Amino acid sequence: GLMQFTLPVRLCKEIELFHFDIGPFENMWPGIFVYMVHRSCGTSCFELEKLCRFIMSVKKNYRRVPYHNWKHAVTVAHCMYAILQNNHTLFTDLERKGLLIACLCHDLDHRGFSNSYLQKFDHPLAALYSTSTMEQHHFSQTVSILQLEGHNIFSTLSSSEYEQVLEIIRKAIIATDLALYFGNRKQLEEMYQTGSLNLNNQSHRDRVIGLMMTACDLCSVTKLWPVTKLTANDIYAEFWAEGDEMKKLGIQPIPMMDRDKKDEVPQGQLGFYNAVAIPCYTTLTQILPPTEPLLKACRDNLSQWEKVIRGEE
């Protein structure tokens, strides 16, 4: 009822901004998440005791991998929170419940390997799920945790609202498969430009939410440059581990995953800001003007990678 979460002043202020970094104090991340559910949804969205137990079961099922870890999940939920808070009146009650949860859960039980590696390794999960292999697993792990005893944070919904929210979560996690992003963004681009984009059209809303998921998932690129840089190192730590495993399967990895080709990182960053990041936040800005700060920050980081390449760092 009356038991607000409250954050220190610097955090209380800076958490509202897109570029906020959640800090190195793991013990504070659960409290940050709850704070954001309470402001984004209401103190009355979730039974606190259930929410707390869900969060701690979610955290327990992230692994100790350089990038795809509990910090990443909480980072991705904070970017979603800042989008929701900036676009108050665009989303439903169900959407605001579903999407923070979806984001906290979107990489559950990730091992640091790509859908590619699972498929080339011939991992069991590539037999159960032949595309978006990991993302189908991350959805499946979310349903498992929701069905633990005392873990149904959705217990007050009806049969159909519950089914709607779980359907919001499932699409939202699947959309974090970057292979799906390109086609999603192009259709949104064609729709927005021709004026056919329609936010009572559920198939259009799904597209838009998928684009939000990509934006939150990649939100590394929208931080202050030192966060961006030190995050990049965790990303590459995983990719080069996967490359070492590709070499052990007797397969020359893609350069992105080859630690011997570290020199070309700056160039690959530009490619990715140009081919993925910037177009994502550009299209996001057009559909939701108040997310422009993500585009601006992303552009500032593109310029940092250019400086790296001109040897000015």
Output the CA torsion sign for 178, 183, 185, 188: negative
Using alpha carbons, select from 95, 87, 147, 67 the residue that is nearest to residue 292: 87
242 binds Mg ion (CB under 5 A): no
Q: Which tokens sit at 260? A: 């011997």
According to the annotation, is 107 in a ligand binding site? Answer: yes
Q: Which is nearer to Mg ion, 176 or 228 (CB)?
A: 176
Q: Half-sphere exposure of residue 196, counting CA atoms within 13 Å on the CB side?
A: 9
Q: Are 232 and 269 in contact, with CB atoms under 8 Å apart? A: yes
**Residues in 82-121 at the binding interface with Mg ion, rule: CB under 5 A:** 107
**Residues in 61-120 at the binding interface with Zn ion, rule: CB under 5 A:** 107
Q: Return the CA Rg of the chain.
A: 19
Output the CA torsion sign for 129, 133, 134, 140: negative
78 in catalytic set: no
According to the annotation, is 151 in a ligand binding site? Answer: no
Choosing from 38, 68, 137, 151, the catalytic residue is: 68
234 binds Mg ion (CB under 5 A): no
Q: Which is nearer to ligand IGZ, 22 or 265 (CB)?
A: 265
Residue with tokens 């080069």: 240
Stretch that binds ligand IGZ, among 117-125, 163-171, 257-265, 298-306 (CB under 6 A): 257-265
Choosing from 95, 135, 177, 217, the residue that interacts with Zn ion (CB under 5 A) is 217
Stretch that binds ligand IGZ, among 6-14, 36-44, 241-249, 259-267 (CB under 6 A): 259-267
62 vs 53: CA distance, rounded Å: 15
235 binds ligand IGZ (CB under 6 A): yes
Choosing from 61, 272, 300, 308, the residue that interacts with ligand IGZ (CB under 6 A) is 272
Q: Which is nearer to ligand IGZ, 40 or 228 (CB)?
A: 228
Q: Are 109 and 124 in contact, with CB atoms under 8 Å apart? A: no
Smallest distance, ligand IGZ to C-beta of residue 4, A: 34
Q: Are 127 and 107 in contact, with CB atoms under 8 Å apart? A: no
261 binds ligand IGZ (CB under 6 A): yes
Q: Which positions touch Zn ion (CB under 5 A)?
A: 107, 217
